Amino acid sequence: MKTITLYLDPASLPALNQLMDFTQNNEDKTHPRIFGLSRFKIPDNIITQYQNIHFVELKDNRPTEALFTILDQYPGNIELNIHLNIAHSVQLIRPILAYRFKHLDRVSIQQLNLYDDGSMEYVDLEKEENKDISAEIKQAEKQLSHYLLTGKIKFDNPTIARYVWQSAFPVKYHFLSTDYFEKAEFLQPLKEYLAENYQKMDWTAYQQLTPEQQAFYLTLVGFNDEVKQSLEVQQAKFIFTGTTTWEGNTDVREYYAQQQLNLLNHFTQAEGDLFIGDHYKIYFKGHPRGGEINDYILNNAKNITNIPANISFEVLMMTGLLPDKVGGVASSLYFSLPKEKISHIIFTNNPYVKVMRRLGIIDESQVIFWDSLKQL
Numbered sequence: 001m002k003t004i005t006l007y008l009d010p011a012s013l014p015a016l017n018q019l020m021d022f023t024q025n026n027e028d029k030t031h032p033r034i035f036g037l038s039r040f041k042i043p044d045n046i047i048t049q050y051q052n053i054h055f056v057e058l059k060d061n062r063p064t065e066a067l068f069t070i071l072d073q074y075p076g077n078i079e080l081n082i083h084l085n086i087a088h089s090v091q092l093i094r095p096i097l098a099y100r101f102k103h104l105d106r107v108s109i110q111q112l113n114l115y116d117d118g119s120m121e122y123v124d125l126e127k128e129e130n131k132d133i134s135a136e137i138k139q140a141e142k143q144l145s146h147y148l149l150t151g152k153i154k155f156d157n158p159t160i161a162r163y164v165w166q167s168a169f170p171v172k173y174h175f176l177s178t179d180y181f182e183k184a185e186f187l188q189p190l191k192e193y194l195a196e197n198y199q200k201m202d203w204t205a206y207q208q209l210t211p212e213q214q215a216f217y218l219t220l221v222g223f224n225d226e227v228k229q230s231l232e233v234q235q236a237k238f239i240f241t242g243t244t245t246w247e248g249n250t251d252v253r254e255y256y257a258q259q260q261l262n263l264l265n266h267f268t269q270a271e272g273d274l275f276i277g278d279h280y281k282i283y284f285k286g287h288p289r290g291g292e293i294n295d296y297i298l299n300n301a302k303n304i305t306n307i308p309a310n311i312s313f314e315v316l317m318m319t320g321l322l323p324d325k326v327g328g329v330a331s332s333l334y335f336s337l338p339k340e341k342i343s344h345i346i347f348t349n350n351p352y353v354k355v356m357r358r359l360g361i362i363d364e365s366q367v368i369f370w371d372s373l374k375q376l
């Protein structure tokens, strides 16, 4: 009997937690591990320390067929310890379930650990506000059972379906906001159902690691001393946080890049609507997937210090390097930021606005959408 651990995430936040799990378990050099993290490359000098370490690409939010070649290397009874993105959990587990069908006598699911993609889970839940949640949960359990028995996916409520894994497997959920599940009264049946199966993402995990494990983790997440030193300057600091669009259309991507530059100018220029003051040093923390939208900022702004886009904002919180003020387009990073550090959050009944309002992240003041800002 052998456990294999799979770490799967096409996004950022689940991967950040899963890389913490790997760090906590890093003394075990031979435990089989399969990494399917789209946004993170494990350094070669770390890979070389481990045996039975494997890598799999994700395509259309699932591990490719290459997963099967890896699993075939382990011919005995295997129990899978699976770490997944909540929003994409149904797709990410699909090929795992297909493999289990083919090898029903030797392959089992030990447990699931699930982590929020980010704001999407909350915006999606907010849209379920008028439904009978208790009834939705019962139907989703039934349809999950059909998926597990047939390998076919058909959910009447794809959103609620993300939360009924306990009906089939031992599970632990790690939520960006546990407050949401208490504050949203319509979700009371879901909070009750989830019972003892969830906790908040633990941003204090890093502080509990050993000095060696702390250094290891920082290497996993792309943090380096140069970035550290940039953020240790003796001057008040403002970090402008970027966003992205998933659209490929050039007109849309160009519009996003232009509007975001205009938004930056509204924070940093004396005549801007959101003017922060002249005494701040300005940094740019671009979206990990901003691409040429990030480039547009660096090419067109001045006196701005880049923080490499691949570095998740939450690492600054972990390392004690948060700035005085943070501002930009609504992002999951705002869910874990001390409220005193928010300058302004800008949006592109709006369900995202509703989520942030429920959580006390934004106040009762009229929300600012970026198309309401004068072109400076």
Ligand SMILES: CC(=O)N[C@@H]1[C@@H](O)[C@H](F)[C@@](OP(=O)(O)OC[C@H]2O[C@@H](n3ccc(N)nc3=O)[C@H](O)[C@@H]2O)(C(=O)O)O[C@H]1[C@H](O)[C@H](O)CO
Binding pocket: 011, 012, 013, 117, 118, 119, 120, 121, 123, 241, 242, 243, 244, 245, 246, 285, 286, 287, 288, 309, 311, 312, 313, 314, 330, 331, 332, 333
């Ligand atoms: C509603 C919806 O669709 N929310 C999804 C969200 O669940 C998903 F997870 C992600 O989350 P998103 O909120 O962009 O941010 C997720 C994480 O990325 C890192 N980050 C982001 C921006 C930045 N300037 N510096 C950073 O470091 C932080 O670790 C943060 O917590 C995502 O793909 O990661 O993208 C958003 C949006 O699709 C996207 O914002 C475009 O509107």
